[PDB]
């Protein structure tokens, strides 16, 4: 019951800085790399009293891969896993895919094969990237093509980071987001999305962090990925493996875009002045104020909702909680999936990061939802791309890499064909 | 005074790699002017169907430009489309055979055969050069030493190529020798989609300085016979190594040609001819006193349907443009 | 590892270049003798991107200091930091350019640029993987304008893929220190727009304006102006010199700041720029830096940005700071001031933040901006050009070096075309 | 959080403004250096409403000190509290107004107000939510009268919802310190009544009268008068600066003190105003303060309230005190003195009490009053205006700045209309 991870781009490796911080903390694994069957999913034993992740960090720019090599997590990570490039993709989908992409995939794809044969219970994959720069967009679509044709049958958990609706770190990333989604549609088995201003807004309102940096964001993002894989790492009343997400949330093979959320997002001082049970955290995860993307669920409908709980949670009260969700009319499921609910329970609760921002709670929920609410984000992301594409803005960089007018049109009609499915299933 | 830029279309037969793959013959024609692709008519001035020959295309496409450019105006003929479509076949072909050869040597024979029909006192000073754009460098084809020429404006601010080996020719047989010398010097690599993949934008200029000894009215006609490269998707071609760097400057120029065509078609302000050096020498063709006619060679296969339909959008967007002749 | 070969040409380019090495050497804690004495080990991480390791823990910059007047090298050599440079890099002629573009481009620098090109090859082949060429020159005079564009042509010829970075100090009619300014400027930009990918249009008139209004200096020497221009050079390369929450390479700045290949003429800025009196009466918070960055008067070019619109801007921040407050300020400066931003681009801002501020200061920022208002610098230079060119004054001194009148015509057409295209997207 | 941007214009407005910052800084326990050293933490609660936080636990007031004479800023800068202000806020010309309304409004201040408006935008956008603009100016002279009303027009134009608070120091014929008093006064109030929502009509004649009768001072300097006017400014804003049993915002004062939009000309007061000898012979109880508040001679305007009637009055109290004794005194002062209160309004009194008295004093109060008797200040100014306007004396100095005679006619009509409407509700 293993699952190997890869981390592409600045956003991916920055997630790995905090995501593996809480994985090794949950299993008592110090940064030195030592202190039974729980840690085998994400840590392999090396001889006697030592552990190594099944992790790969790739970034064509050498800026932050070496930062881990000189940071505090030097002994934990095997130094050959920390793969680095020579020059930067520089916010170009084509540069990370054809020029600089094609010089290092021969190293990392065959290295990912090495971890496969080292493992036996490889369930699937979980990649970490963003649609902002060329690394997270170009190199992943290149690698996903060669990883899909290599294995195919195995699953892939895509934890992408959108560009926000109005907030944004760059100008060219609509070209990156529309081009990487043209290839990611037919390859990724599950596409989990994250937004920038939403997670800024969540910790400001609920957690009361008025001035967060990116390291504060990646703590709870790793908690979200840690929650879905906690059922594999620990025992519970009703465990769910990675294969449940493909069978429960993907009604059709093209609409495979869930939405992640987490609760209770509560600070240290508010935990004492607020009681936590399954009912209020369940209703807290469905409201738009706590969704990880800037899309309101009332505009659309929930096709499916996988509720993954942690900590001491009995199995009879969850049935009462989901009953209140079904009768509440502000959120409504589709008629084609009336029993749109899956429950998962784990006895081991979440762990608090030392020096972090989140507070320790006896129970927590990590709810995944496949819905039509993401079609609004696709439309406004596709709409803003049309103004730059109409004037041929920033096209001379991509076609200078080797592309042409054609694949931009294929990326446009593919997005319309994707939205053609969302308006179809929204009936 | 003012004329319309003449857009035409041509299709080849399905090649060996296309019929072996089992590509469907999606080409459907409603007359000799419109083609129906994906249930959409794409209108052109003359749609040369798949069964057309070399002589059939030349008699309707570039037969009129011989008389236009020798009247005193300038001409420009140039092919567009993805790789393996037949741009090198339609323009050059095989110059030894009368039937297999393309539009370029037929233009050569028609001008000289036309001039012999004229009176002896009509003097004709015909100088010809041949050069290409390779890695964004103006590589001369009739000369090897000159690596990169410089773009210069004429007396009335119109861009030309300075230092080009404008060889004064006398007979048409000498012109065929110049093309064979330049055809060998053209950078042509091998690819799975196109074995004869022209990796450069070859321009073959015919400057016919013509003046009558009796009337003394001097005239000049520039005829730019250009053969562009193909807009090659790297996924289909698999360009790696040196040819990958060639694909950069090729699609950069073709996209830049798409930029000025998209800029001029909408009636924009600037029309960036200075975006690329390929667009510079075409500035007299696009926004000058030339009766520019353009054909596009398109592949009829459904495998290349994406790049094919984009060629038609480039064509129909170019249809709304009018030249100030 | 994304190395950078530095070029300095002309008296102004050598002066801003000389002070530029003074600033970043203090950022890395490098002695004037070249020995490293920095406190933090992160300074020695990416020290290779501007220096080369030598024996005895000594370092030497990859600075190719070019000129035609030997007196400029003596001032740099006798300066506080002259001893750190390699003595071999000082390639210099005997006779000055005399403020003639054609001399440095055809006769004086054409024989010297062949010797300089071998040194560029020496520093490039010693690199692991060079990213771009950081050049510093003024368009006033003959050395920086004429020989500099010639040197850019050869490097662009041999390296058609690297990032050709230039800092073109171009003056205005408000400060006309030389009668031959338009011919030096109009002919230099004829080569820059065709070859280069970055052109930081800095003006002396704006630079003096900073010293009086926001810096509040009584006697601004040229060295005070060199300190400000050096701050912009250290700001744009701060991402690829230290770890940061968002590391944007110069290629990653060029991809966002260049929506079309010719539209690569920028307008730099820097903050906090506080006087000695206003030090304690100013908060170091992030919104205070942002309002000083986008201040119309705090631009280092004569063109006010309110007269046009930004195609795309960048803000390279330095020091520890929350990303959320940076994103809100990048958000707010396009909501209310949407008239100063073109709306056919949805998001005109680029962000970046390093985890190491400047030495002595707690926080800092650096601005890049490609505005449609910048065309008036080219418009007024064309007015000065056509004013002197209509009667052909002082053109015969260019004919002696083989330069023809058509080259002035081709430069003016390419100059005027540059004015029209910024007027299109305004 | 209901922030307040402060404006100071003219010599008198800068003097009362300079002493105003002296008083409230001592209420908050703020050093002249700006560092906070207060005993109670409640002083630092709403410190943002007049100050901005700075590094090193330093604070700076949001004081935009405007003038046309640079000598006024030197006196404020060299004063006991000049070092706390930001040096950037001191926007000032070179030549004084010369006691001409048209100079400051059209020629002298019109070029300077554009620079001042950018500083108003700087302090406003840094705020969270500004409530109103607290302006201080005298209607005598050209700077406060002419440039001040121009500045009020631009701020009222950009901010048509905020509370435009002004403290118009208007003299009487009993103290005629300038021959051009009526033209400066008549033209200034032409703009104030159309734009502003508060006009605290303070008179120098009444201010000197306080010093002799109830304060019993031998040599009342202007600084003694500035201490009294500062007490009124600190009194009206005491609700929104500290916790209180009834917190009335300036909008909550404007809603009660303005029964019709033009009737917004007030008459301030303050108590306890005791001499040095009468300190021990006076009880600090609440009824003793109330009789001093409503005392006809203890008003800061030349118009006695007995000659007319109060439309609506307010009493902002300070310090610990029972609400019942306050309500009885507010009740009793309208029962027996009902002739001095219009009865078509049932209750003409507004009450408010803070839980923090002034520094050094145990209890205090502050009076606001919109009386029909206030019209005689406008009547006598109209008599002086028509006396000089009937033969058009000294009008030609206003024609040089483009001001026409019809603008004097429009001001006089709006002036005389203001006199008639207070006569209506008398
Ligand atoms: N901000 C600064 N500007 C300078 C400085 N020195 C010169 N300049 C400005 O740049 C203008 C021209 O630049 P240069 O001094 O380098 C003339 P150059 O050396 O290139 O030619 P020659 O000296 O004739 O060989 C010049 O007129 C000044 O306006 C300086 O130290 N700092
Ligand atoms: N209660 C006080 N009244 C003052 C003070 N200074 C002046 N005044 C009175 O206000 C009257 C006019 O106000 P100003 O002194 O400000 C004249 P202003 O500066 O606005 O114009 P110019 O000085 O001509 O530029 C003036 O005649 C005095 O009666 C003061 O410090 N305190
Ligand atoms: N939530 C979150 N987003 C991040 C983080 N780091 C980067 N991002 C986002 O990732 C986007 C771009 O990601 P990348 O593709 O990795 O950018 P890059 O690696 O610097 O690409 P280059 O410019 O070519 O070097 C940015 O727009 C950010 O908004 C992070 O730590 N947390
Ligand atoms: N109409 C046609 N009939 C028969 N054969 C053709 C035709 N068009 C092309 N071919 C075949 O294709 C081969 C090469 O095609 P060609 O080089 O003309 O493609 P291209 O479009 O010129 O490529 P490039 O992108 O280099 O311009 C020729 O050798 C020829 O046999």
Residue numbers in the entry:
A (entry chain I): 2 to 36, 52 to 443
B (entry chain Y): 5 to 329
C (entry chain Q), D (entry chain P): 1 to 426
What does the paper say about this structure?
Microtubules are cytoskeletal filaments that play various important roles in cellular processes, including intracellular transport, cell division, and establishment of cell polarity. They are highly dynamic tubular polymers assembled from α/β-tubulin heterodimers, which are arranged in a head-to-tail manner to form protofilaments, with ~13 protofilaments associating laterally to form a hollow polar tube. In vertebrates, both α- and β-tubulins have multiple isotypes encoded by different genes, which are intrinsic factors in regulating microtubule functions. The GTP bound to β-tubulin at the E-site (exchangeable) is hydrolysed within the microtubule assembly proceeding via longitudinal contacts with α-tubulin, while the GTP bound to α-tubulin at the N-site (non-exchangeable) plays a structural role and is never hydrolysed. We determined the cryo-EM maps of α1A/β2A, α1C/β2A, and α4A/β2A microtubules in the dominantly populated 14-protofilament type at the resolution range of 4.2 Å to 4.4 Å.
